[model samples]
Target: MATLLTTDDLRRALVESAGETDGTDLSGDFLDLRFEDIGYDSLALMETAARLESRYGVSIPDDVAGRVDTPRELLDLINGALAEAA
Candidate 1:
């Protein structure tokens, strides 16, 4: 069996990857259109994927890395990766 990644897991992963300490809520609505939305760029995206891979022992494909942009997408990717690992 593989572990499912939750919103908190995503948050912690993001925090670890970005080294940010603002303590932002992962369950909140980040799609409301704000300057912070731009933070989900290529670097952050790759970092998140890499961090998730390292922490969960699942490798995300490079092609899939370009497809995940939002937290929801990231969650889905993580779930899929976990399933494949299982």
Candidate 2:
């Protein structure tokens, strides 16, 4: 069984992908974040997806990219990714 990915983990990946300092503690819901406000561009999003895929051995399809704009959504996506790997 694969370990479930958490919001903090996702946030760290996002911060790394965006090349920003990850100082904020992510809330459980992740709706507290504004995606556009964080300076994430398409390249950053692709990098984030790639990092997640490499780290967890799962692929996030392009269709799901737009759906994961918030931390909560990212967590859900990662959970699904982990499940798929399992």
Candidate 3:
């Protein structure tokens, strides 16, 4: 099973979906990294949200998802969803 929905979890999820599991510039403290910094848009957010749904069994609705512009926000959102589920 996957680990907790941390930044690494997000990184690994992105790596598994996008580039690779290695040092592919998808790492290095993305806690404050923004979507635009990574050249990401709605499609990317939807894609990542889909992956999160399938893997972590979490739901990040489209509306609140817009506020998740940074890695920290995404991490908090995922964890918050998981907690809300609990």
Q: Per-prediction TM-score, please?
A: 0.73, 0.74, 0.76
lDDT for residue 61 in candidate 3, whole number 0-100: 79
lDDT of 2: 0.70
Rate residue 44 of model 3 by lDDT: 67
C-alpha-based local distance difference test score of model 3: 0.70
Per-residue alpha-carbon lDDT of candidate 1 for residues 20-64, written as tens digits (9 for 90 to 100): 665555445442322246456556666877888887877777766
Model 3 vs truth, CA RMSD: 2.8
CA lDDT of each prediction against the hidden true structure: 0.68, 0.70, 0.70
Q: Model 2 reaches what TM-score against the true structure?
A: 0.74
Residue-wise C-alpha lDDT for candidate 2, range 8-74, written one tens digit per residue: 7777777788775665644455555756666655567667777888888877777676556665676
Cand. 3 TM to true fold: 0.76
In TM-score terms, which candidate is top? 3
lDDT of 3 by residue, 1-86 (tens): 33357677888766655544444477768777787777566566667767887777788778766667786787777787777666
Clash pairs, candidate 1, are none
